[PDB]
């Protein structure tokens, strides 16, 4: 649970997240899905300390699902990201903070726009065209800075994402066991089962 | 435990003109919040039309200057009174500094003079010996206050020509000695206002083909 | 800091940034991070500039003395090894150095990475410094052996730019060098500020940055 | 910082320098270190600057409320007792080092207070990084039965010693005189011996020098009618 | 590397029109214990120099012997040892300054702060400081330890800059020094009432005054001070 | 600091120096370490000035309230209040206090309360950093039922030596005399006691 | 590690003739990594402008906090808050976290709507007020800014001249700071008009 | 420079060594040969601290090559391993020890036997049928314990080695960039160029 | 440890307790801390017993060799040899030594050499952990040119108090008298000195 990438293209947001989980010197799992659906058109990927990541993610999920039922309405990606940020900003000055970094990929149905938010465990929120956490950006941002356009198709975004993963696979010392890729658009959330 | 190092404050500044060079520095010597001397010269004439200032830990600075002056003396003896070129002095100092790589002279050193083509020259050193030639360099306590100002007023950084709106840079016109001295004085006056270790007095040494000249200016004593 | 160097059809390219910092304070905007050992040898610089300057200038002495004794230019392999052997004497004492030794000899163009650990690696491409990861991305995706001198120079130049932009401790200017069998050729100092805007326009890259 | 307090015939005077520092950098060249607790009870503070204000305001607030409750003019011993008990409670974590002086129906008073809560009485006191320079002057020139003019002179001379000799102190001298049966007179910038000399050059730029990408009007007004 | 054991506090000095003055108390403290009350910390070298030393006393006694040996060695094969080739203040200082810096460079310092005061052959006043780090500086007034914080401010009111030196007489300079020593006695917890004072004048030579005492002290106001705030009795 | 309390025929006398230090700097050279908690119950303070002042103030409050309800308290009672504060808060205090007082029934009494919060009733007590140097002198020269003049001389001579050797002690010698006659403050200056 | 220098950034404010100016860089980073070039550090509540440097999460948090407080102030007072009053509110709000502070360096700038007097102020992290007549600086390049401002500044500058002065103070200070830059914004404030300009600078 | 395996089969010794070299967070090389030929029928692979590994290996190589020339004779694998062990045992009590673990694969031409020696940086020597250093054994030894026979062919040894590498590639968190495999037999030393 | 050396009319007397501790355990209760380095030059030792014994042995060797070449050494000379060892090896020593001796020319002399290696010639000297408690008593009761009996009483009374208060000191009081008449050893037991 270290590698999470995000890229916002023309009409969708794409989140790529590693599949590895390591305990001690042994890789326990190579098919772990480091993501939670907060609402039909909002997906959150996460990375950080063991345990805290899932617990936080599920806690956020429960709160957004509670809001959805109460108001019979889906919160905008912006509203969700602000809620999440506050929870982390609240958490950093707690007795034991939740050591969790997240990417929130959502499609705003009102504005008809994809939106990617990057939030670290301190509660540092930024809206970006593409983002990453930890050291993931060190390897990938030079490629994204070069190739990224805001009018890219979903297929072009996936191709640029493949190049980012290939560079990670070449220059990163750790084996992260490939990535699970998910797309968030007007029709909702779907997983790219071949990557 | 014994700490062999200390900080005597002080700030120095070297600027290279087209046919001259200046090396300036405040005359205040301090420890912690006390003043030791309001006038303790820091920039020296080392001979062969070279001026030098070792800023930082005064004891190591006095030792390095003392050694370099000695290196000049022996250069004359050994090589038939040949003049020591500024570039040769620079390389020599590198070796003086690196001889203590594992117990350095805690000083940031600058020398100024003229190159073998008669143009202005300034060389800047770190405590361990790395060096390089520059046009403008402030060293010491208030270096961070002064260098941005010099980037702006000497190399005309971030300054463009009116009407073009960032398309055409301000041309890099050469500065006169009088113009440089103004920038030096205003640099130190500004530093004195916002840095407690800077004050008392300013001594500037100007190097031309005619020789070395000194200029002194008062600074605020608070 | 950011430095790289790579072999290709017509020699080796060497590109470096120019920044030096003292914490958050930028102490130098223009620092020569390439060492002209001799007309056929170059050395990059990573870590302690003092240690890079001193030991590589001392290497030049040894390389010159070699030529005088043997009446033949020293190889890149041998030169790189003399340097690594100097490092191994002060093994553990606290030296800090990461340099690529670039040159052309009998075996063609040559490139060796040498670090304070005494490590000595041969390879077609290397990059060191706080911004090497950004540089590698551009390099890996655009590098070919079939590169022209013009394109290769641009690649090394563009790869430093990538690092200068993202890395806080990299920037200032780009220094280019091209190493041929007739020696090395300096291809100038390129301000990053000016280069960035230029590349952004011509290339279309850095869309996220407003200009 | 350099602050002092000096008793005299019919009252007391305090003084201070005007330099505030963050390490070796001067944040403010004309800081105000003389604080008012009540109309005729003033204090000077050294140490952590946010603490010297915060604590002087808090006690000043409670003093004012106490004065209203008791229908009496506040006493210096009241401010002293409230300050030290607050400071003691926080065991020095509130880095306030104060010299408290004033006049009240009881007479004229001069005290010092350290951050841990200890207090002292005296005819002359000094606090701060320049306290040793100031005290040297006070010990050389202080005497019993000083006049108002002699005390102001001694006080400002002691601050000057700190200004010139202490790197943590500088700029100007502030003074406040609290005499019995009179209004307290606060003399802001009583002395100004450190005016910056005129610069050699004007650094006013030509209009159009800075490169601009975008311009826009900022709507600071509220939502408009119609 | 060591730590000082038996210590000597402030040494103060200043220049005046025709020479220099230097003073230092006669105490050898053992931490907070005022152990030794008959310690001379001003050491004359010839008739033109006085070296005042603060800090570790065992190191002071070592330096005292180096200077005594220096005088002996200078006289060797030197017909002009009591004339043109006599020791100067500048010679004595530079020697000490060399020793101090060398010792710190071996990480085995002489734990001291020294002030060499004297008058040169040409009548010039000499006053320069050196300490355990090998740091040197010169000023119209010099003081070590506490003297730097309390004495200098007072002495600088008399001689604030170089141009004030000719205007300052020996009577005024001595008075300022003696006042400073009183202030240090009031305020330095490691000071003593007894002290020594030396004057090196270019006309009247070296005048060494021993067994001086701090006098004209103000204490009477203490009777009126009661409690720490609210106490009246 | 150098402090002591000595019982004699007519009552008790407290004695103290007047120096307060912050390292080697004398923050106050005219300190009053003789503190009043009741009319004829006083204390000598050593240790953290902040701590000893805060304690003495609380004690003065307790005895003032005691007096309003139950009349004049005993010196023993005062010592118990000091002890209760010093013992229960020993982890956060650095206070060495001597309590001295005069009753008509009990006459002059002295209690010492060292760091731990223990209590010890004694004919006389010494404390502070400078007390170490006069343990021998005081043991040799103390007598029970001395006269007022003899006791003043004993304290004066004792603190004179404590001041002489202890750098943390000095200034003037303050004394407070507690008898049936009332409360008398005394002061002795350096020129007087140094020549002893 | 040092919270006040993880994310980086700078703010500077200046007074002129019947005007004030406040400016900030646009960088947000994770130490050496540049993360955003659109992270504005200046906010406004009515006609009062607040620049905040330091730890980004606290910058965002405090903006939302002062938006909250100024919105209630206005509903109760039936008027917009003034710079002098707001300055005290910022001071109060920071000191209430004296032993768990926000790692920030706020800068207030504005013009009193009644007196028309220009106003600027700076604070330390626990709310110590620095009410300077001339200029205020904050951030990772505050030393650099002090040096520029102290020499470039002169009193009673006209709006369009002040712009050049503050812009050059910021730009050249940021170019000597590794953790500042990536863009810059300048606000020029007058009693009833405010102009916002984005500056062109090197992107390294 | 962490993974080195060795297996002694019927008529040869096979050494497998990783190709990765990492500096900081970047993989500098993925084709590094962590081995030196000490003599025509003796190969030594190595792993440990950066720099020390090659320096030690080359120092040993020089000494064995010097011996070979002086005596016009190839030392037995046993003799070479004992020399190497002594140098490491000498080194561990030096001012700055050489932090190097080695495997020595040799074919004894006198006895007509393959021989594998495992020596760690302390000078702990053991002759084994198969060996490894660091954590390599934790993953691979259970497979080797199960499948290994002393009468295995070179081809069977390579197949068992492939299974060991596959298990490493699955359960190890680090990406070691595959292995270079070399065979030591009666005809000398050769490299398996497709693995 | 409690040690002292006192000059008087006819010469000098060294005095010491006899307790050596390892923490709170008394390793030796009859130690002889009065050490002979020459016929009429003795020393009192405090600090590390290993260090002070090794020093005293080396000094005794130097003075024995000095005597063979240049005749009887002075007390000053002996103090110089002690100092030279203690000063040059101050980093690896913990020794507090008092040197006392008798010449016919110079008579009784006392030199003290504290931790640093400094030398101080005095009329009398005190040292050891127990010396702290008698600084006041000794300063008040010392006189120059006392008689032998007066000086013995002074030392006896002084060390009696040092022993009384210092736990590290105790046992018997040993003394050595150095005069023209020769060398006299004295000893005083607890029942004698405790009742003083
Ligand atoms: Mg000052
Ligand atoms: Mg950059
Ligand atoms: Mg030992
Ligand atoms: Mg006992």
From Swiss-Prot, chain B:
The keyword Amino-acid biosynthesis does not apply. GO terms for biological process: proteasomal ubiquitin-independent protein catabolic process; proteasome-mediated ubiquitin-dependent protein catabolic process. Disulfide bonds: none annotated. GO terms for cellular component: cytosol; nucleus; proteasome complex; proteasome core complex, beta-subunit complex. It is found in: Cytoplasm; Nucleus. InterPro entries: Ntn_hydrolases_N (IPR029055), Proteasome_bsu_CS (IPR016050), Proteasome_sua/b (IPR001353), Proteasome_suB-type (IPR023333). Keywords: Cytoplasm, Nucleus, Proteasome. It comes from the Eukaryota. Its main location: cytoplasm. Non-catalytic component of the proteasome which degrades poly-ubiquitinated proteins in the cytoplasm and in the nucleus. It is essential for the regulated turnover of proteins and for the removal of misfolded proteins. The proteasome is a multicatalytic proteinase complex that is characterized by its ability to cleave peptides with Arg, Phe, Tyr, Leu, and Glu adjacent to the leaving group at neutral or slightly basic pH. It has an ATP-dependent proteolytic activity. Belongs to the peptidase T1B family. This is Proteasome subunit beta type-6.
From Swiss-Prot, chain C:
GO terms for biological process: antigen processing and presentation; fat cell differentiation; proteasome-mediated ubiquitin-dependent protein catabolic process. Induction: Up-regulated by IFNG/IFN-gamma and IRF1 (at protein level). Up-regulated by TNF (at protein level). Up-regulated by tetrodotoxin (TTX) in glial cells. Up-regulated in Crohn's bowel disease (CD). Down-regulated by the selective inhibitor PR-957. Down-regulated in mature dendritic cells by HSV-1 infection. Up-regulated by heat shock treatment. It is an enzyme of class 3 (hydrolase). The active site is at 1 (nucleophile). One of its GO terms (cellular component) is nucleoplasm. GO terms for molecular function: endopeptidase activity; threonine-type endopeptidase activity. Autocleaved. The resulting N-terminal Thr residue of the mature subunit is responsible for the nucleophile proteolytic activity. It comes from the Eukaryota. It is found in: Cytoplasm; Nucleus. Its EC number is 3.4.25.1. Its main location: cytoplasm. It catalyses: Cleavage of peptide bonds with very broad specificity. Keywords: Cytoplasm, Differentiation, Disease variant, Host-virus interaction, Hydrolase, Immunity, Nucleus, Phosphoprotein, Protease, Proteasome, Threonine protease, Zymogen. Belongs to the peptidase T1B family. This is Proteasome subunit beta type-8. It comes from Homo sapiens. The chain holds residues 73 to 210 of 276 of the full protein.
From Swiss-Prot, chains F, I:
One of its GO terms (molecular function) is endopeptidase activity. It comes from the Eukaryota. It is found in: Cytoplasm; Nucleus. Pfam families: Proteasome (PF00227). SUPFAM superfamilies: N-terminal nucleophile aminohydrolases (Ntn hydrolases) (SSF56235). One of its GO terms (cellular component) is proteasome storage granule. InterPro entries: Ntn_hydrolases_N, Pept_T1A_subB, Proteasome_bsu_CS, Proteasome_sua/b, Proteasome_suB-type. CDD domains: proteasome_beta_type_6 (cd03762). Keywords: Acetylation, Cytoplasm, Hydrolase, Nucleus, Protease, Proteasome, Threonine protease, Zymogen. Its EC number is 3.4.25.1. The active site is at 1 (nucleophile). It catalyses: Cleavage of peptide bonds with very broad specificity. It is an enzyme of class 3 (hydrolase). The keyword Cell wall biogenesis/degradation does not apply. GO terms for biological process: proteasomal ubiquitin-independent protein catabolic process; proteasome-mediated ubiquitin-dependent protein catabolic process. The keyword Signal does not apply. Its main location: cytoplasm. The 26S proteasome consists of a 20S proteasome core and two 19S regulatory subunits. The 20S proteasome core is composed of 28 subunits that are arranged in four stacked rings, resulting in a barrel-shaped structure. The two end rings are each formed by seven alpha subunits, and the two central rings are each formed by seven beta subunits. The catalytic chamber with the active sites is on the inside of the barrel. Belongs to the peptidase T1B family. The side chain of Thr-1 acts as a nucleophile, and the N-terminal amino group acts as a proton acceptor. This is Proteasome subunit beta type-1. It comes from Saccharomyces cerevisiae (strain ATCC 204508 / S288c).
From Swiss-Prot, chain G:
The keyword Nucleus applies. It is found in: Cytoplasm; Nucleus. CDD domains: proteasome_beta_type_3. The modification Phosphoserine is found at residue 30. It comes from the Eukaryota. The gene is PUP3. There is a cross-link at residue 69 (Glycyl lysine isopeptide (Lys-Gly) (interchain with G-Cter in ubiquitin)). One of its GO terms (cellular component) is cytosol. GO terms for molecular function: endopeptidase activator activity. GO terms for biological process: proteasomal ubiquitin-independent protein catabolic process; proteasome-mediated ubiquitin-dependent protein catabolic process. The 26S proteasome consists of a 20S proteasome core and two 19S regulatory subunits. The 20S proteasome core is composed of 28 subunits that are arranged in four stacked rings, resulting in a barrel-shaped structure. The two end rings are each formed by seven alpha subunits, and the two central rings are each formed by seven beta subunits. The catalytic chamber with the active sites is on the inside of the barrel. This is Proteasome subunit beta type-3.
């Amino acid at each position: 649970m270290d590698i999470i990438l995000g890229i916002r293209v023309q009409d969708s947001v794409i989140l790529a997240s590693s599949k590895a989980v390591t305990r001690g010197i042994s890789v326990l799992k190579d098919s772990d899905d480091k993501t939670r659906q907060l609402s039909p058109h909002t997906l959150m990927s996460f990375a950080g300390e063991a345990g805290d990541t899932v617990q936080f993610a599920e806690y956020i999920q429960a709160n957004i699902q509670l809001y959805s039922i109460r108001e019979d309405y889906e919160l905008s990606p912006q509203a969700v990201s602000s809620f999440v940020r506050q929870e982390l900003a609240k958490s950093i000055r707690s007795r034991r903070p939740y050591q969790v970094n997240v990417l929130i990929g959502g499609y705003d149905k009102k504005k008809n726009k994809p939106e990617l938010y990057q939030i670290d465990y301190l509660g540092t929120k930024v809206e970006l065209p593409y983002g990453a956490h930890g050291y993931s950006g060190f390897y990938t941002f030079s490629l994204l800075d070069h190739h990224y356009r805001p009018d890219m198709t979903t297929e072009e975004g996936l191709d640029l994402l493949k190049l980012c993963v290939q560079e990670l696979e070449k220059r990163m010392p750790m084996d992260f066991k490939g990535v699970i890729v998910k797309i968030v658009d007007k029709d909702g959330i779907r997983q790219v089962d071949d990557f | 435990q014994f700490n062999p190092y200390g900080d005597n404050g002080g700030t120095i500044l070297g600027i290279a003109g087209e046919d001259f060079a200046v090396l300036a520095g405040d005359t205040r010597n301090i420890t912690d919040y006390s003043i030791n001397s309001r006038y303790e010269p820091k920039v020296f004439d080392c001979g062969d039309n070279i001026v030098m200032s070792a800023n930082g830990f005064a004891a190591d600075g006095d030792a390095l200057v003392k050694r370099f002056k000695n290196s000049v003396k022996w250069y004359h003896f050994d090589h038939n009174d040949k003049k020591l070129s500024i570039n040769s002095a620079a390389r020599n100092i590198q070796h003086l500094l690196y001889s203590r790589r594992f117990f350095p002279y805690y000083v940031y050193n600058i020398i100024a003079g003229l190159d073998e083509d008669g143009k202005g020259a300034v060389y800047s050193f770190d405590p361990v010996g790395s060096y390089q030639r520059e046009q403008c360099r402030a060293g010491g306590a208030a270096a961070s206050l002064i260098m941005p100002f010099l980037d702006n007023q000497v190399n005309f950084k971030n300054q463009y020509e009116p009407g073009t709106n960032g398309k055409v840079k301000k041309p890099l016109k050469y500065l006169s000695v009088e113009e440089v001295i103004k920038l030096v004085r205003d640099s130190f006056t500004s530093a004195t206002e916002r840095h407690i270790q800077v004050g008392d007095g300013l001594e500037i040494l100007i190097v031309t083909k005619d020789g070395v000249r000194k200029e002194f200016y008062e600074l605020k004593r608070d | 800091t950011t430095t790289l160097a790579f072999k290709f059809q017509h020699g080796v390219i060497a590109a470096v940034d120019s920044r030096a910092s003292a914490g958050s304070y930028i102490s130098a905007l223009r620092m020569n991070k390439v060492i002209e050992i001799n007309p056929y040898l170059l050395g990059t610089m990573s870590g302690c500039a003092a240690d890079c300057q001193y030991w590589e200038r001392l290497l030049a002495k040894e390389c010159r003395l070699y030529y005088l004794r043997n009446g033949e230019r020293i190889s890149v392999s041998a030169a790189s090894k003399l340097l690594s052997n100097m490092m191994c004497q002060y093994r553990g004492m606290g030296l800090s150095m990461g340099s690529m030794i670039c040159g052309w000899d009998k075996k063609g163009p040559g490139l060796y990475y040498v670090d304070e650990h005494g490590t000595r690696l041969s390879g077609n491409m290397f990059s060191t410094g706080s911004g090497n990861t950004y540089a590698y991305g551009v390099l890996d995706s655009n590098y070919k052996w079939d590169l022209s001198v013009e394109d290769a120079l641009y690649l090394g130049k563009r790869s430093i730019l990538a690092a200068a932009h993202r890395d806080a401790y990299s920037g200032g200017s780009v220094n280019l060098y091209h190493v041929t069998e007739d020696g090395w050729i300096y291809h100038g100092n390129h301000d990053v500020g000016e280069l960035f805007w230029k590349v952004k326009e011509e290339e279309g890259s850095f869309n996220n940055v407003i200009g | 910082t350099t602050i002092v307090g000096v008793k005299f015939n019919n009252g007391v005077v305090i003084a201070a320098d005007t330099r505030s520092t963050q390490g070796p950098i001067v944040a403010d060249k004309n800081c105000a270190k003389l604080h008012r607790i009540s109309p005729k009870i003033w204090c000077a503070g050294a140490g952590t600057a946010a603490d010297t204000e915060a604590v002087t305001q808090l006690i000043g607030s409670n003093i004012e409320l106490h004065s209203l409750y008791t229908s009496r003019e506040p006493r210096v011993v009241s401010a002293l007792q409230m300050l030290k008990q607050h400071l003691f409670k926080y065991q020095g974590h509130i880095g306030a080092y104060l010299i408290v002086a004033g006049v009240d129906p009881t007479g004229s008073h001069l005290f010092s207070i350290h951050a841990h809560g200890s207090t002292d009485v005296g005819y002359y006191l000094s606090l701060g990084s320049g306290s040793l320079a100031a005290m040297a002057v006070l010990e050389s020139h202080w005497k019993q039965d000083l006049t108002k003019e002699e005390a102001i002179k001694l006080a400002s001379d002691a601050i000057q010693a700190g200004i010139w000799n202490d790197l943590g102190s500088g700029s100007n001298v502030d003074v406040c005189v609290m005499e019995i049966g009179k209004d307290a007179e606060y003399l802001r910038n009583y002395l100004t011996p450190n005016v910056r000399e005129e610069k050699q050059k004007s650094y006013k730029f030509p209009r159009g020098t800075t490169a601009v990408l975008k311009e826009s009007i900022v709507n600071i007004c509220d939502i408009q009618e119609e | 590397t060591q730590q000082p054991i038996v210590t000597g506090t402030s040494v103060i000095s200043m220049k005046y029109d025709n020479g220099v003055i230097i003073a230092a108390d006669n105490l050898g403290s053992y931490g907070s214990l005022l152990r030794f009350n008959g310690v001379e910390r001003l050491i004359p070298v010839g008739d033109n120099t006085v070296v005042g030393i603060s800090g570790d006393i065992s190191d002071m006694q070592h330096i005292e012997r180096l200077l005594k040996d220096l005088v002996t060695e200078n006289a060797y094969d030197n017909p002009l040892a009591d004339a043109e080739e006599a020791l100067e203040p500048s010679y004595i200082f530079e020697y000490l300054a060399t020793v101090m810096y060398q010792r710190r460079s071996k990480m085995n310092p002489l734990w001291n702060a020294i002030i060499v005061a004297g008058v040169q052959s040409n009548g010039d006043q000499f006053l320069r400081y050196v300490n355990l780090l090998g740091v040197t500086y010169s000023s119209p007034t010099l003081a070590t330890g506490f003297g730097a914080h309390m004495a200098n401010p007072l002495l600088r009111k008399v001689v604030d800059r170089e141009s004030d030196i000719p205007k300052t007489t020996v009577q005024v300079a001595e008075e300022a020094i003696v006042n400073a020593m009183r202030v240090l006695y009031y305020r330095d917890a490691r000071s003593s009432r007894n002290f020594s004072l030396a004057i090196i004048d270019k006309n009247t030579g070296l005048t060494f005054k021993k067994n001086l005492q701090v006098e004209n002290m103000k204490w009477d106001f203490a009777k009126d001070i009661k409690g720490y705030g609210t106490q009246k009795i | 600091t150098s402090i002591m309390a000595v019982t004699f025929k007519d009552g008790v006398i407290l004695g103290a120096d007047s120096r307060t230090t912050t390292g080697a700097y004398i923050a106050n050279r005219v300190t009053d370490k003789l503190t009043r908690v009741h009319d004829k119950i006083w204390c000598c303070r050593s240790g953290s000035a902040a701590d000893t002042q805060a304690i003495a103030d609380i004690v003065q409050y307790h005895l003032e309230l005691y007096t309003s309800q139950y009349g004049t308290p005993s010196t023993e009672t005062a010592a118990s209040v000091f002890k209760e504060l010093c013992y229960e808060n020993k982890d956060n205090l650095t206070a060495g206090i001597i309590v001295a007082g005069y009753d008509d029934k009990n006459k002059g009494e002295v209690y010492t309360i060292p760091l731990g919060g223990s209590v010890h009733k004694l004919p006389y007590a010494i404390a502070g950093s400078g007390s170490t140097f006069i343990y021998g002198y005081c043991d040799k020269n103390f007598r029970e039922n001395m006269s007022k003049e003899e006791t003043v001389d004993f304290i004066k001579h004792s603190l004179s030596q404590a001041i002489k050797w202890d750098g943390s002690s000095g200034g003037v010698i303050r004394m407070v005399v507690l008898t049936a006659a009332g409360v008398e403050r005394l002061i002795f200056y350096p020129d007087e006691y140094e020549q002893l | 590690s040092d919270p006040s220098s993880i994310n980086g950034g700078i703010v500077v404010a200046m007074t002129g003739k019947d005007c004030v100016a406040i400016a900030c860089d646009l960088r947000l980073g994770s130490q050496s990594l540049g993360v955003s070039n659109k992270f504005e550090k200046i906010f406004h509540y009515g006609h009062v402008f607040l620049g905040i440097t330091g730890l980004a999460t606290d910058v965002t948090t405090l903006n939302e906090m002062f938006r909250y407080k100024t919105n209630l102030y206005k509903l109760k007072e039936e008027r917009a808050i003034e710079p002098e009053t707001f300055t005290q509110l910022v001071s109060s709000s920071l000191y209430e976290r004296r032993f768990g502070p926000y790692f920030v360096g706020p800068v207030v700038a504005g013009i009193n709507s009644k007196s028309g007097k220009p106003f600027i102020a700076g604070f330390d992290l626990i709310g110590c007020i620095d009410e300077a007549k001339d200029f205020i600086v904050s951030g990772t390049a505050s030393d650099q800014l002090f040096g520029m401002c102290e020499s470039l500044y002169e009193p009673n500058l006209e709006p369009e001249d002040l712009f050049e002065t503050i812009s050059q103070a910021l730009l050249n200070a940021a170019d000597r700071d590794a953790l500042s830059g990536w863009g810059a914004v300048v606000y020029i404030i007058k009693k009833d008009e405010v102009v916002k300009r984005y500056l062109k600078m090197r992107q390294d």
